[PDB]
């Protein structure tokens, strides 16, 4: 019942979000061939849909 | 005169359209004339709906238009039925508005909604059976009140301020739905409505009981509550015995004030057409008593 436990991972535009959300990572020079364990958590669009 | 109305189509009908017609049984459709026999062109609201002439014009036309229920429809014979006052009828709702038991229903032009489709149902090449919204009293009077407030505020204001004002005002939520007024336009119809509203407000300012102006302030000296905090906050932007008191004067003044209020009130109130006492658990139909 807090707001978060990692503000650098829970915000809409925090460091971890831009780092691992593919909707933000595709803006960067990112190579899609590598699997990332935290893709499922930070890919907000896919889980929302 | 007529308890039965027969509508016939010039076009040949497909079995898909016949199925849609036999599904639309018990719905409400408007008729301009209240006559024995009409062609299918003058059925529905596609006849009148020029979006350039905004929502106020269509509302004024629709409230003069008469209503009828749907019936024994078959191949190229519709057979609409006009309900009489006081009987119990089965009516099928078509809009996304949720109907709950005990609410009174009103007729209004359809509003916008989230799924953005608008569903161009029953297009006979050009003619398209656009059907009105049947709305419970709070939301419908909210439409009317917001339109009147829109007209009263918008005059002598720039489009930039009006942009935010309409972006907040045009959107209404009722039972967690999301609607917005299609076309707010300042026609002579709304201008005359505002003329009536301004005259009524001037009269209620003039003839009102002298103590009812200061009752709020006496209570504010008496009390301190969230309701009264908001009441004072409204009047704050412009901010003991009475030397005489006579009950007859107060009685006459409040009778006049009630006349003026009832004059102002029905600029927002819509003449109820149906009162519900039944609901299907899927909200798709309800049983209602008709008011004329």
């Amino acid at each position: 019942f807090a707001a978060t436990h990692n503000p650098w991972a829970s915000q809409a535009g925090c460091l971890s979000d831009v780092l691992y959300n593919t909707r933000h990572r595709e803006r960067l020079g990112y190579n899609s061939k590598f699997y990332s364990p935290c893709a499922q958590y930070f890919n907000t669009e896919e889980i929302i849909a | 005169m007529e308890a039965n109305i027969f509508c016939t189509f010039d076009h040949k009908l497909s079995i898909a359209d016949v199925g849609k017609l036999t599904k639309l049984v018990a719905a409400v459709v408007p008729i301009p004339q209240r006559l024995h026999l009409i062609k299918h062109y003058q059925l529905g609201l596609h006849q009148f709906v020029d979006h350039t002439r905004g929502y106020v014009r269509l509302r004024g036309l629709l409230r003069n238009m008469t209503l009828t229920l749907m019936r024994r429809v078959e191949g190229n014979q519709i057979l609409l039925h006009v309900p009489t006052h006081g009987l119990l009828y089965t009516v099928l709702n078509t809009g996304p508005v949720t109907w709950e038991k005990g609410d009174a229903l009103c007729v209004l032009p359809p509003l916008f909604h989230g799924p953005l489709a608008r569903e161009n149902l029953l297009t006979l090449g050009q003619w398209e059976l656009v059907l009105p919204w049947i709305v419970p009293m709070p939301l419908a009077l909210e439409i009317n009140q917001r339109l009147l407030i829109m007209g009263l505020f918008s005059l002598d204001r720039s489009y930039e301020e009006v942009k935010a004002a309409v972006q907040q005002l045009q959107t209404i939520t009722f039972r967690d739905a999301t609607f917005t007024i299609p076309d707010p336009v300042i026609d002579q119809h709304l201008l005359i409505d505002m003329k009536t509203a301004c005259l009524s407000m001037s009269m209620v300012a003039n003839l009102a009981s002298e103590l009812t102006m200061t009752y709020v302030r006496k209570l504010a000296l008496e009390d301190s509550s969230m309701l009264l905090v908001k009441c004072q906050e409204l009047l704050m932007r412009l901010d003991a015995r009475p030397q005489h008191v006579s009950p007859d004067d107060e009685i006459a003044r409040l009778s006049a004030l009630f006349v003026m209020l009832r004059q102002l009130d029905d600029l927002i109130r819509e003449q109820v057409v149906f009162t519900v006492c039944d609901v299907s658990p899927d909200n798709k139909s309800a049983t209602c008593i008709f008011k004329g």
């Binding site: 595709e26 020079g29 | 918008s154 720039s158 489009y159 009006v162 309409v166 707010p184 336009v185 002579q188």
Partner: protein, 471 residues
Amino acid sequence: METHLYSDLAFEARFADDEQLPLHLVLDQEVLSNEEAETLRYVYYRNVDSAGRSTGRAPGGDEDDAPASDDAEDAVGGDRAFDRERRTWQRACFRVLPRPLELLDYLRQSGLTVTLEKEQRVRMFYAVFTTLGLRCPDNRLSGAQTLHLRLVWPDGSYRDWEFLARDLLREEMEANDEVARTDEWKGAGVSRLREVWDVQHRVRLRVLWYVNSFWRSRELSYDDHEVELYRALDAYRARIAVEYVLIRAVRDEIYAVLRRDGGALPQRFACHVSRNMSWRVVWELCRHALALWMDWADVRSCIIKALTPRLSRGAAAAAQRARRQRERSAPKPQELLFGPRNESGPPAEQTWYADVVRCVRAQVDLGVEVRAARCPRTGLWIVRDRRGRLRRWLSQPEVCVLYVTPDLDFYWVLPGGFAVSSRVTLHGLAQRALRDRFQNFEAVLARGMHVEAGRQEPETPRVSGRRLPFD
């Protein structure tokens, strides 16, 4: 009739704060055409004191008095100057009467008892009724004050008239159950009717003096000091000269760059040429055409018409967006493969305004619109008409044309497309003069128009007298 009475009541109500007294005006076929009266939207007035200061700008001087420096980013002050000039303009209540009438008979036919000295009937084909206010900061009113008048039509067009107090009040200040104010207003009537003229002596308009006007009783004082009127005259001279000093700046820039380039003029508009044409005659025709343009340039020259949209509030945001879109490096591959489609670059076609001058017969055209596109095979300019037709006046040997771009770059052209190019220097004048003399009207909501901005314009209201009056 009703506008004058209502305006008297309304100015009486607010005189405590605004301290403006009402002045009732009726106008006829001398100020505006029948079409303009039939299609009038708003009437506006603005007061300028004897110091040349508008009512609505800081008394001690403002930052608008500072000059503007030609940059499109801070376009003549941005949106804040537009908001200030919006604040200074005040709106009056007006009525339109489209059927022919004479005021004496019309008022006698109404409840008002006119009591003029002589029964001279004054006829007019149509009457527009309005009442404007002029502010006295204290109980003293000055005869060197000047009042501006504006009529606004639904197309956003407007016309400016200004007249000073001493013409408006030449003789007026020297002439010094329960009753409803309407009853005594009608029973007291009016007796004095005078003609007022604009300072330039271009518009005639009538003023009515109702004896029961509330401004009578305040025993206000009036005077017109000579030095005060001299100040008003020199301030008016300063106001009127904006377009002419801009044109002179264009002249001096043209001559300066013609001196700088040694007279060698390179081609900037695509046109075929011949080595064996006599160009000396072309040069002398250019001289004569330039002199004629210097003579006949008007307030509606292309440079002012192009300056006008630069002052609208949209210009500053548009300039920021355009500069940021130009201020870009090469796009990264990531944005090309993924995300939104690329921002649309500036179009291959532009809208221009130009002045065309003829030497064969004395004739110039000033408010000419032209569309400009670059010829791909040569990189030079091609001038197209508003319908898309090609402009042939480039070929015509007797014609020289001055073009102005939206970004205030101007081309001077003699036959053959050989051109003289320079930038407009609006540095010469204060921001106040440019922002006051020219500015697009911004619409305020009224009857018959959509509340949602950007929607299609409905039928123009067009209160008319050729139809039966509508109710």
